[PDB]
Amino acid sequence: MDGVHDLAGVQGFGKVPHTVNADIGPTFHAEWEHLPYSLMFAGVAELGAFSVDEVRYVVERMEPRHYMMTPYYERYVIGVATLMVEKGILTQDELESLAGGPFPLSRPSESEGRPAPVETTTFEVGQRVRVRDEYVPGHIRMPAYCRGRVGTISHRTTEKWPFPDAIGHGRNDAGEEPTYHVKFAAEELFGSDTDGGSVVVDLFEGYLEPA
């Protein structure tokens, strides 16, 4: 999904709000901040209501201006609440009644997702690969800066996981794929407009093709 959350390479932001080793304060800066992660785990591990991938996607589905003005932990409150309503576990009415006011949620999905690709290649360390030149309106774990770009395999995972584009929509056809650490030269991604060396992206097999 080509949403505003796909931030890598966006220009115009200021300084990162940190100097190295500065005191970051407590883990949680407010008494509610542990709730989104804890209730995500309740949803995933206890209820089996959704996957972690579905949580990433529901946050991607926040209305774009809403996403941009919402602090991190609050996005996950909104995302988890949205999933609970979409899965029929909760109603928006009861959330707003309990909250004592408006509780706007993420927007409905505009894609049913897609299955794990039927045709993929097992790649080896050192092989040159291209990121498939594909556009996916639903969940995908490929940042746009690498779409269509060429890099070299530095690692093939020894474990396999469900394809995010499927399991991020709660589909039954996510299968399993390993992922690959793909090393791209900075200039391959940003031309002359970068000060870096290389970028390594961890890409599902189904996002790749031989170069």
Partner: protein, 196 residues
């Protein structure tokens, strides 16, 4: 035009979500409290520091950590949520590694601790992939011109830690002494371990 939606205070919304689920019997007794304790007390960059200090003083463990990070971390019992498949990445005299999740906040929670606000910032997520040298410089870390910077974007299930170079002046230090100088920022890759 472009205005924020009306919203109840975030605390009220977060506790509403808790109460709605809890009131339906969907949240076990002590569940969120137990996670809070895990997040605050167990998930910690002290664990990553312990791993680095061991690697620095034990060539065999260093080799294991760099070839099968998951197995190395499992020896300490530090695998966990958002830290089940671990890869450690080696800094060298010509290479500096830095970790980000450009798409959200993906972090090796059990060994680095939950990500700090700055790591989840739009500034870091947008900029470090494209201009890591300038970002690090602004953050207080000057990377010498003869050193390649490699940014690992945490886009799938691999969860990363940086194994920084061991600084001069620490020869013969104990594991406890070495752990002390390996900070959270060293494990993320934005800082180099400092010797007083």
């Amino acid at each position: 035009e472009n205005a924020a939606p009306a919203q109840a205070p975030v605390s009220d919304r977060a506790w509403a979500l808790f109460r709605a689920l809890d009131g339906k019997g969907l949240v076990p007794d002590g569940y969120v409290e137990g996670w809070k304790k895990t997040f605050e007390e167990d998930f910690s960059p002290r664990r990553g520091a312990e791993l680095v200090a061991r690697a620095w003083t034990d060539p065999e463990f260093r080799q294991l950590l760099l070839t099968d990070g998951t197995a190395a971390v499992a020896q300490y019992g530090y695998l966990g949520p958002q830290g089940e498949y671990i890869v450690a990445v080696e800094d060298t005299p010509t290479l500096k590694n830095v970790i980000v999740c450009s798409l959200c906040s993906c972090t090796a929670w059990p060994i680095l601790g939950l990500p700090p606000t700055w790591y989840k910032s739009f500034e870091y997520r947008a900029r470090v992939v494209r201009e890591p040298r300038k970002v690090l410089s602004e953050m207080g870390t000057e990377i010498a011109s003869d050193i390649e910077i490699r940014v690992y974007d945490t886009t799938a299930e691999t969860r990363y830690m940086v194994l920084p170079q061991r600084p001069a002046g620490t020869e013969g230090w104990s594991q406890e002494q070495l752990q002390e100088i390996v900070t959270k920022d060293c494990l993320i890759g934005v800082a180099i371990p400092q010797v007083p």
